[PDB]
Amino acid sequence: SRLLLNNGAKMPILGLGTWKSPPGQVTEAVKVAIDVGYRHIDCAHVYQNENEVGVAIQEKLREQVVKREELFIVSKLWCTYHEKGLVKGACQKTLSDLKLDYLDLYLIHWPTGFKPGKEFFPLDESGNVVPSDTNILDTWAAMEELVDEGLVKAIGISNFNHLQVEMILNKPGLKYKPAVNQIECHPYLTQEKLIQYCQSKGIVVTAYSPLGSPDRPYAKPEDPSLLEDPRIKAIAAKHNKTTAQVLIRFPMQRNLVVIPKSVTPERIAENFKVFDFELSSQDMTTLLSYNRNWRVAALLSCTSHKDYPFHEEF
Ligand SMILES: NC(=O)c1ccc[n+]([C@@H]2O[C@H](COP(=O)([O-])OP(=O)(O)OC[C@H]3O[C@@H](n4cnc5c(N)ncnc54)[C@H](OP(=O)(O)O)[C@@H]3O)[C@@H](O)[C@H]2O)c1
Ligand SMILES: O=C(O)Cc1ccccc1
């Protein structure tokens, strides 16, 4: 039900994602989620809805439905705030929008640093993304002091390949190990090598886009759909469960934290009923065989960035 992190904290294996969740629908979505039983919410400054997520959290706290210690709130540092002096300020902005005094987990959203400014994806006259000269090690040291100041209880990373994780682990004077590495994971991108590597170093893996993210903006009619895969429908039918429920239970049995997104009350409730059944070892091996190495989030505009994470095998 909860996984143990290297800072001694317990992280709910199931959480609610908020990317693409409209500001006018997410407050109600988070409220319903908390009522249903969710104790983990995944957020990010770049989602432009943290203020609205925060309204939900504050309402449930005032209502006594949950106490702060029961909730596990996660947010992420955007690429335009990688410089030393900007990290504390970005965390503080997120804390105010969410209306909390500490975050349970703060992740470096992407290993790529962009030029600071108002634009999330700063461009030049040619049209490509302008990088920052900062590196992963300097940004990590800034994340470490947020723990020393009490702003966050744990720090982690997101979309980091194995070599980038190595860099941090082998950094001189390392004070806090990354507690979590949140990566894209589902049956079409199983990530067996990155997962095995992270797990061997005591780093918890969080799987994002577990349903294949059918609502991504760059969606094409010829792209593969997990929710409609006949082979996955068969396994679901065999268990008297929905395909989404199977796609959510899949990573849990691999000892991964899963964070499916939804703004629909019935779906939010449906996605929660995944603790009452088990996928057989055969079901797990079969699902793993469906890997096509297909990524939903490839950050294609940063293919030339010095820190792009997807050139390495894992
Ligand atoms: N760290 C990173 O770089 C990063 C990147 C991507 C995502 N994430 C996190 O991962 C979270 C989840 O990934 P995601 O948002 O890309 O997509 P996802 O959870 O894989 O899929 C969300 C989509 O599936 C639909 N859905 C949810 N439950 C369903 C069900 N039971 N039956 C049918 N359809 C269902 C949702 O529709 P409705 O909402 O309409 O119900 C929505 O369209 C994000 O919100 C975010 O918090 C992190
Ligand atoms: O990185 C993410 O979580 C998804 C995302 C893609 C493009 C713009 C904002 C967020």
Single out the catalytic residue among 38, 47, 106, 176. Answer: 47
Cβ neighbours around 79 below 10 Å, total: 28
CA distances 225 to 26, 131, 210, 221, 292, Å, are 25, 33, 11, 9, 12
Residues 181, 160: contact at Cβ < 8 Å?
yes
- The CA 209 to ligand 1 mean position distance, Å, reads 5
Residues 75, 94: contact at Cβ < 8 Å?
yes
Angle at which helix 192-200 crosses helix 162-169, to 10 degrees, equals 10
Q: Is residue 112 within 6 Å of ligand 1 at its C-beta?
A: no
**In this structure, what token pair is assigned to residue 271?**
């996605």
The one-character DSSP state at 212 is -
How far, in Å, CA of 158 to CA of 153, rounded?
17
Sequence-distant (6+) residues with CB within 8 A of 279 are 235, 239, 246, 249, 250, 253, 287
Q: Is residue 46 within 6 Å of ligand 2 at its C-beta?
A: yes
How far, in Å, CA of 291 to CA of 191, rounded?
9
Residues 75, 44: contact at Cβ < 8 Å?
yes
DSSP secondary structure of 4-33: E-TTS-EEESB-EE-TT--HHHHHHHHHHH
Residues 180, 157: contact at Cβ < 8 Å?
yes
How far, in Å, CA of 259 to CA of 40, rounded?
8
Structure-determination approach: X-ray
Ligand 2 closest atom vs CA 44: 3
**In this structure, what token pair is assigned to residue 229?**
């895969």
User: Measuring from atom 4 of ligand 2, which residue has the nearest CA?
Assistant: 19
- The CA 239 to ligand 1 mean position distance, Å, reads 23
Residues 3, 255: contact at Cβ < 8 Å?
yes
Return the sign of the alpha-carbon dihedral for residues 310, 15, 113, 193: negative
Cβ neighbours around 300 below 10 Å, total: 10
Residues 162, 130: contact at Cβ < 8 Å?
no
The one-character DSSP state at 186 is B
Number of H helices, E strands in the chain: 10, 10
How far, in Å, CA of 314 to CA of 309, rounded?
9
**In this structure, what token pair is assigned to residue 246?**
């199977």
Residue keyed to tokens 């203020």? 51
Helix (H) or strand (E) holding 258: strand 257-258
Question: Would you call 290 a catalytic residue per the annotation?
Answer: no
Resolution in A: 2.0
The amino acid sitting at 250 is F
Q: Which of 300, 288, 262 is nearest to 30 (CA)?
A: 262
Selecting from 3.20.20.100, 3.30.9.100, 3.40.50.11260, 3.40.50.720, what CATH number does the domain 1-314 have? 3.20.20.100
The one-character DSSP state at 130 is P
Domain range annotation of the chain? 1-314
